[PDB]
């Protein structure tokens, strides 16, 4: 059992629309801090909501009595901002959150301290890398393409301000996710060195080819489903960032989902607007099903050569996403249409993959009939396109 430690109403800062919305938050002793559109009445917790290893800031801008939960999630620093009516309310909340997180560090350290099996033993610096290209900036860091001097190999390096936080063994065993190769700290930075595939950007391949056949999109979609299934069920994590720009190919033509993002909240949104799920736009409560929406948008784009929702005005784009039904090119087949309609259900509870079975729902869809999912995971499907 997981018990509620503190609960109540808070104003949640919005990223895309309303800016400040009232939500009913539960802080639980497993570390989850989750907001709901109304007092829930009653799925497995997602680590995205954990307050474990957070740092807590009080602040008076842009609103008196606001507090921030800042957390490092894998290689990305995220910040969750809230506001209450009184400075007293805020002290109750920050105190409860701290107490929960403290109790998690304590029980964990005690457990590892007890289970250490002559792992009581006691690799790199900035200088070993050549800068080549800025890949992106965020509020607390930057991502750059680097060449490792000693080997000639290319990596993406994520460089974070160390002070806002204060792993390579924790790497996921999945072929199509971005593996962390090194992690190191300087005097003022924490840097993550991660793989960089050299088969090109799928965004660029799709642009040049105009559209992918249903069979080519089925191959890429299967590799993506396999990776998201792993994240969801082995890591208890949602990706939240699936867009075409975040798909690359390796030299053999297999997919790599990239981990190059940084939050931009605090010095143009974070998520690319055309890929955002309705419940993310509305800061409604969200779960594993947000990734299946992203899969829908990306496979719509591969098989149709254009987005399912677009407008240069992002408020009209948001309204398309929330309100308009999808139309399909006249040449798309019914298995593809069935998959895409299912993935792009606006209600996460009705969306394909949104039930307790998660990715299994999608793996069983008739669009994927004949895919051997064990072969997908082992890179035994032969790629329809080999990059140069």
């Amino acid at each position, epitope marked *: 059992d997981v018990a509620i430690v503190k609960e109540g109403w808070l104003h949640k800062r919005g990223k895309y629309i309303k800016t400040w919305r009232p939500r009913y938050f539960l802080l639980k002793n497993d570390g989850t801090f989750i907001g709901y559109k109304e007092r829930p009445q009653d799925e497995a917790p997602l680590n995205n909501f954990s307050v474990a290893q957070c740092q807590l800031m009080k602040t008076e801008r842009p609103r008196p009595n606001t507090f921030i939960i800042r957390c490092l999630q894998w290689t990305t620093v995220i910040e969750r901002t809230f506001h209450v009516e009184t400075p007293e309310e805020r002290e109750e909340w920050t105190t409860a959150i701290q107490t929960v997180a403290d109790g998690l560090k304590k029980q964990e*350290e*005690e457990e*590892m*301290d*007890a289970s*250490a*099996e*002559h792992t*009581d033993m*006691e690799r790199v610096t900035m200088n070993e890398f050549e800068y080549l290209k800025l890949l992106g900036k965020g509020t607390f860091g930057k991502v750059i393409l680097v060449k490792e001097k000693a080997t000639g190999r290319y990596y993406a390096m994520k460089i974070l301000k160390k002070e806002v936080i204060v792993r390579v063994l924790q790497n996921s065993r999945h072929p199509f996710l971005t593996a962390l190769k090194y992690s190191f700290q300087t005097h003022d930075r924490l840097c993550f060195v991660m793989e960089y595939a050299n088969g090109g950007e799928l965004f660029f391949h799709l642009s040049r080819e105009r559209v992918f056949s249903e069979d080519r999109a089925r191959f890429y979609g299967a590799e993506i489903v396999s990776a998201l299934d792993y994240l969801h069920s082995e890591k208890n994590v949602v990706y939240r960032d699936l867009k075409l720009e975040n798909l690359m190919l390796d030299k053999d033509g297999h997919i790599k989902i990239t981990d190059f993002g940084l939050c931009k909240e605090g010095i143009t949104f974070c998520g690319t607007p055309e890929y955002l799920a309705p419940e993310v736009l509305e800061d409604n409560d969200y779960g594993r099903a947000v990734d299946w929406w992203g899969l829908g948008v990306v496979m719509y784009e591969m098989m149709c050569g254009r987005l399912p929702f677009y407008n240069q005005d992002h408020e009209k784009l948001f309204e398309l996403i929330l309100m308009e039904e999808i139309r399909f090119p006249r040449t798309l087949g019914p298995e593809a249409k069935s998959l895409l309609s299912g993935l792009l259900k606006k209600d996460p509870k009705q969306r394909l993959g949104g039930g307790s079975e998660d990715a299994k729902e999608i793996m069983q869809h008739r669009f994927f009939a004949g895919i051997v999912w064990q072969h997908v995971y082992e890179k035994k499907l032969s790629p329809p396109f080999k990059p140069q």
Partner: nanobody, 113 residues
Framework: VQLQESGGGLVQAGGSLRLSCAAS????????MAWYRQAPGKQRELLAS???????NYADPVKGRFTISRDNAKNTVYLQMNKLIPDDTAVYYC??????????WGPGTQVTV
């Protein structure tokens, strides 16, 4: 809370010394304990560890000559050091896994052979 080493000093090669680590505010029963040493120019070296089960392991340079033991009662770990060679000269530290990964160390105790 804190770990504190004692029992070091000057000693002639082939001699013996017993190091102790008084754990004040921690519980050595609940944790893998290990001994370490570090020489002026070198990095810190794992020497020995005792599991909560009592199982011991040792690194090669010391296997046979040192023995690490845990006294649950006195909340202390020990390193019995036997037949000391010059290359044993160093400052010796005891530690838990958690403190180890956070680079938190007691004051250490100097052994000179």
């Amino acid at each position: 809370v804190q770990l504190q080493e004692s029992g070091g000093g000057l000693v002639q090669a082939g001699g013996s010394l017993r190091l102790s680590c008084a754990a004040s505010g921690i519980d050595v029963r609940i944790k893998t304990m290990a001994w370490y040493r570090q020489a002026p120019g070198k990095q810190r070296e794992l020497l020995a560890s005792v599991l909560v089960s009592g199982s011991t392991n040792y690194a090669d340079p010391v296997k046979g000559r040192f023995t690490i033991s845990r006294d649950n009662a006195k909340n202390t770990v020990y390193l019995q050091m036997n037949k000391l060679i010059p290359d044993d000269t160093a400052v010796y530290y005891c530690n838990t896994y958690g403190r180890l990964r956070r680079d938190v160390w007691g004051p250490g105790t100097q052994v000179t052979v």
